[PDB]
Design a protein around this ligand. Structure first.
Ligand SMILES: Brc1cc2nn[nH]c2cc1Br
Ligand SMILES: Brc1cc2nn[nH]c2cc1Br
Ligand SMILES: [Cl-]
Length: 333
């Protein structure tokens, strides 16, 4: 008949057990601050869909980052605000410091803790084996945390991971696509950037969960250990699934379609073809062999699964052998 329902393996009912006000972001009332407490210093390079600035809080001379919320549904604005407030103080989550409106313009803006504008994309193709493990483990802290708090990020990519490499600090940013997980809810599949979209988004399976973020993490990991940016390099959303099909194989893809009774968009009929599941060794060469190990491949393999239920949870990922020396070293500090 229709698609078969799905529920998250972990943290399934955490928002149900909360008070209504925790997740019911439409009912949130914002005390809007005054943007004249802040003065914009300079525009930060964040691509074409960004109004992000370094600024100075003139009450205490403290550096901050300001994000002007581009015209968008008021629904989205309260959602990002409520998520950031709910996650405030969590491991490697960017800290929302203030919420303000321009007196004249009335345009809302978010004020964050200062970070340097050095994202993971700029660093992540030049890391040692150890540093890939270290920063992957730091990202997993943020993901396990937000998932445990009933929230999925939905836009996990190198550009949304801010790194202070000198201080070995990491912050997960841009919660503008993040959503509260509710069992049985059918979500918008037009989320994330093409190269990091999970198969669920690509085949239009709407009843997804936290596991979406773990596919994204998998693409990031593959990119780093194989030095291939992006790992799945599609021309468009349809070809994106074909790129994945050529690595993961068509057998697991079609079993996944059958398991959830997904109605596959007719454009896929000719382009998917028939492909074996490729061994990861295929991608290893002399310029990346130092980043690739049995532990890394075993870990990667357990992230990049068509079936969202089969993927490691963030906490399961953190327990993998790949991270043992990171866990050991962390206990010593
Ligand atoms: Br300060 C400040 C000045 C602005 N001009 N336009 N948007 C703005 C936001 C802030 Br915060
Ligand atoms: Br830099 C920076 C960029 C962001 N985009 N969305 N939230 C953000 C927070 C910081 Br801090
Ligand atoms: Cl949405």
């Amino acid at each position: 008949s229709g698609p078969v329902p799905s529920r998250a393996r972990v943290y399934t009912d955490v928002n149900t057990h909360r008070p209504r006000e925790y997740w019911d972001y439409e009912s949130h009332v914002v005390e809007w601050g005054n943007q004249d407490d802040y003065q914009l210093v300079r525009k930060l390079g964040r691509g074409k869909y960004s109004e992000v600035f370094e600024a100075i809080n003139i009450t205490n001379n403290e550096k901050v980052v300001v994000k002007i919320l581009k015209p968008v549904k008021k629904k989205k604005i309260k959602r990002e605000i409520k998520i950031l407030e709910n996650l405030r103080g969590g491991p490697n989550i960017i800290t929302l410091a203030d919420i303000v409106k321009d007196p004249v313009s009335r345009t809302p803006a978010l004020v964050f803790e200062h970070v340097n504008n050095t994202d993971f994309k700029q660093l992540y193709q030049t890391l040692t084996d150890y540093d890939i493990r270290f920063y992957m483990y730091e990202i997993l802290k943020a993901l396990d945390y937000c998932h445990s708090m009933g929230i999925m990020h939905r836009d996990v990519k190198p550009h949304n991971v801010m790194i202070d490499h000198e201080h070995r600090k990491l912050r997960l940013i841009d919660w503008g696509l993040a959503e509260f997980y509710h069992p049985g809810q059918e979500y918008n599949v037009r989320v994330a950037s093409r190269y990091f979209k999970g198969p669920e988004l690509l085949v239009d399976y709407q009843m997804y969960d936290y596991s979406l973020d773990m596919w994204s993490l998998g693409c990031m990991l593959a990119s780093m250990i194989f030095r291939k940016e992006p790992f799945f390099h599609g021309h468009d959303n349809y070809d994106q699934l074909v790129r994945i099909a050529k690595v993961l194989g068509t057998e697991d893809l079609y079993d996944y379609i059958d398991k959830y009774n997904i109605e596959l968009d007719p454009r896929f009929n000719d382009i998917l073809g028939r492909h074996s599941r490729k061994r990861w060794e295929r991608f290893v060469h002399s310029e990346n062999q130092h980043l690739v190990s049995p532990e890394a491949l075993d870990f990667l393999d357990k992230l990049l699964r068509y079936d969202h239920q089969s993927r490691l949870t963030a906490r399961e990922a953190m327990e993998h052998p790949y991270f043992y020396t990171v866990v050991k070293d962390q206990a010593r500090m």
